[PDB]
Structure 1
């Protein structure tokens, strides 16, 4: 129920499911973005995953344990978005990140546009490590999107 991998985050009403996000299972901890779940508990098979930590400002939340993802973009190399869009198979998209320049330091950022329910898809370095999650960003003048490479602290 906590095997490593990338997962869809789904909601189910009286009929039909909707994909609201994506997340990463690693070291028995599920990692996703706060706006996906609002910190709500997650069903996994027959089991229940409980929120352990979160931060609305970072837009992150972990389940079952502390945040485990600590790989960092090197500021130099191309990365891969492992996009898991609603209703579509997971696909790798390689890209060279731009940068968010903030008063509190620079954050890598990827100029890739996907539906809301792709939020939480992991961004990978060349060794397959997760350097952050996709889905919190800005819209620029031509209507396209730039996502921060959002990484938490371990």
Structure 2
């Protein structure tokens, strides 16, 4: 059994003094890490909202997560959408405007969380237009929350559904 733990990185809030363009228990953004022979390694990032932990399916792979002294366990997942919810139903209902700029709360493995302001690329699909946020970030940054102006989470770094 892999030893997967989550660690709180910071609060999830829109950053006003944020850098624009592209230079590349408790609510918040958590690093997802598993213990190794050398030490922990960061495989993903997760969002804690309304007592439910949201992350990419590929990061967790369905494995049980250790938070504090309590084991937090999966409730729902979608392998096609690469989404997994722990302890409750999916709580992130936030949608992108389709025109407004967004901030990515990045969590590079071994780097301070930073907010980066960027405009997602818009591409058509059979299920309706979608916004793509792609930047030069490590794989361990996967699941990093993408927030709108209101500060709600509109996507996870990996893919940003837009409703208008």
* TM-score normalised over the length of structure 2: 0.81
> What does residue 99 of structure 1 align with?
122
2:100 maps to what in 1?
Answer: 77
Query: Distance in 1 between the 2:123 and 2:43 partners?
Result: 25
4+ aligned runs moved over 4 Å, structure 1: none
Question: How many pairs align?
Answer: 139
Match status 1:20 vs 2:43: yes
Give how far 1:118 is off.
Answer: 0.2
Q: Which has the higher contact order (CA 8 A, sep 6+)?
A: 2
Q: Which runs of 5+ in 1 are unaligned?
A: 136-147
2:150 to 124, 127, 152: 127
Could you tell me how far apart the structure 1 residues matched to 2:95 and 2:136 are? 22
Task: Specify which structure has the higher proportion of strand.
Answer: 1
SS in 2 for 1:93: strand
Structure 2: runs of 5+ lacking an equivalent = 1-7, 9-24
Q: Secondary structure at the match of 2:129?
A: strand
**Structure 2 counterpart of 1:38:** 61
User: What CA deviation, in whole Å up to 9, does each residue of 1:23-68 have, x standing for no partner?
Assistant: 0000000000011011111000111110000000000000000000
1:150/1:103 Cα in 2 relative to 1: closer, same or farther (>3 Å)? Answer: closer
User: Bigger CA drift: 95-104 or 48-57?
Assistant: 95-104
Alignment of 1:108-147 (within 5 A): 108-135=131-158
- Specify the alignment match of 2:87 in structure 1: 64
CA distance in 2, matches of 1:19, 1:127: 29
How far is the alpha carbon of 1:150 from its aligned partner?
6.1
